[PDB]
Amino acid sequence: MLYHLFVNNQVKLQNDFKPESVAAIRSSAFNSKGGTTVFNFLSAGENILLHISIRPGENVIVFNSRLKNGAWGPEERIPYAEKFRPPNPSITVIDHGDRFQIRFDYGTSIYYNKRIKENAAAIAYNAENSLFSSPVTVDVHGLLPPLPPA
Amino acid sequence: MLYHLFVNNQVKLQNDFKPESVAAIRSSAFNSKGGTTVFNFLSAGENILLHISIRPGENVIVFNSRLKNGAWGPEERIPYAEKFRPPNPSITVIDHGDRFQIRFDYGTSIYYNKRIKENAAAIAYNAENSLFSSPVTVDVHGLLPPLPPA
Amino acid sequence: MLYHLFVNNQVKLQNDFKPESVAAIRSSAFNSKGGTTVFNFLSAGENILLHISIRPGENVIVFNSRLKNGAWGPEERIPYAEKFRPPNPSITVIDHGDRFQIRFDYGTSIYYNKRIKENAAAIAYNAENSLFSSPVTVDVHGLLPPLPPA
Amino acid sequence: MLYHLFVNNQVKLQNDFKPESVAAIRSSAFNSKGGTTVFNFLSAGENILLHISIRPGENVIVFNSRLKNGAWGPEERIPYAEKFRPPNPSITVIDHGDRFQIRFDYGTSIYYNKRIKENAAAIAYNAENSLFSSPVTVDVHGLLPPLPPA
């Protein structure tokens, strides 16, 4: 399913993002002078199951989770540099049941253990000066689709 | 190369759309009550190499070409019905040297012989009440990419 | 549909190879010291609709057609050099109704006007010392499948 | 990279199968009356990193590991039923660092924690009366390739 996720907005998924689900987020640009850029996978109750905070200024990408009216938990990090490939940077999130796999354009995948056992119903995108285009292209699959030879 | 083509606007191509090139246009939605929706492949001099005019009101899809300061040439029509697949209808245009191949979601491919021998430097999208989303996701290839088993 | 086409043998297609059909033939190797290698798309009546003769010794790739008990017609050619990419060379054939599009790994596509208006029921592979592996992987589609970003 | 893995034989990988790697194994057929069919991912020292034992007779699929000159470790079983889709059943193995992801044609992915920390240098295929074709088409990726919209 194709969605157009606009900055400081969200998209309601036709189906729950759950184990086996894949979200292929692609940007039509890379604004090298952009600031903190966030992608959140939300549950129906608006609990932030997966928070992805790309912070060029801090040269790090933070992953976290929190209930709608709860406190952020400990942050998990990975360096920002050499993760995105301009001019079409991307983020791919896959639900593996007990954890999330997040792949950017370079480097190895990041694995984040689920903290809030609930499926996602929407995906949000926030930024005051996004590193990416608005909107970003998002193809969501219920399962890994067939793969081309390369 | 991924581009986001907004309605009543256009995108300048990083490279010339020429033989072997492929443009996969995908809409995040289908607006059943939409009106005439157009897609133009323009050369650097603004000549309309390929005019795709979807007319639900006339229940037809029209193809044509014309120079920047010239009149339209003869029209080529095909049925509008049974072409687009909601909620993510699509259009795929391939340059085969002497002609363009246009594929929709249903039916056999449509072939339009080239009338203006120039490569396209841009793609335009116009509509007062677009049948499709704005923007539309557009992936342009320099050549057919590797194919998945399905 | 996936098939394993062995050298000096053939595969009977589950469905007729016809307009919109795509055959993605891939080899698991490139034997640089191989000789003339042939791929034929046959009709039920065993008429050779498309004959693809790769001749390294003559540095050319010949395309032709002939009825089961008929004579070969005029040959159409294209240089052999810089067409295949080792170690996994490929050939992609697409039926466009009035002609065939044949793409290798490099260079522009080759277009061959149909001479025998009939659909194909089988694909044959012949060679005494094939440039390719035995068998070759062959995925046949009833129509162009969705395309990955690249 | 495309390989053709013949039954009761193996293929040496051009590169190490390691984290991020993906092996898409596809059979050109399904032999309903076939017997126990095995796929092994072996390290350079011939240690069996991942043993995939499909047992229709026991109606189960077994996963295990062992050193070249060692005994088998504890077995992990899953149902055989509702896994493979004829006529072209498939198996997809992805290396996620600390574990392997194994996907068949139906059902959710199976995860097998790594037991031997070595990368695989080869893939073996054994069976007296294989459930699958011989050879099997195998596409090995160094990382997840771009995904088609479907």
From Swiss-Prot, chains A, B, C, D:
- Cited Pfam families: Gal-bind_lectin
Keywords, A to Z?
Cell wall, Extracellular matrix, Fruiting body, Lectin, Membrane, Secreted
> Where in the cell is the protein located?
Secreted, Extracellular space, Extracellular matrix; Secreted, Cell wall; Endomembrane system
InterPro entries the UniProt entry points to: ConA-like_dom_sf (IPR013320), Galectin_CRD (IPR001079)
The record's GO CC annotations read:
endomembrane system; extracellular region; membrane
Q: Which residues bind a carbohydrate?
A: H51, R55, N64, E75, R77
An MF annotation (GO) of this entry: carbohydrate binding
Start and end residues of each Galectin domain:
9-141
Q: Which SMART domains match?
A: GLECT (SM00276)
Highest taxon of source: Eukaryota
Q: What does this protein do?
A: Binds lactose. May play a role in fruiting body formation. Displays toxicity towards the nematode C.elegans by binding to a specific Gal-beta-1,4-Fuc-alpha-1,6 modification of N-glycan cores on C.elegans intestinal cells.
Question: Subunit structure of this entry?
Answer: Homotetramer. Oligomerization is required for carbohydrate binding.
What protein name applies here?
Answer: Galectin-2
Q: Which gene encodes it?
A: Cgl2
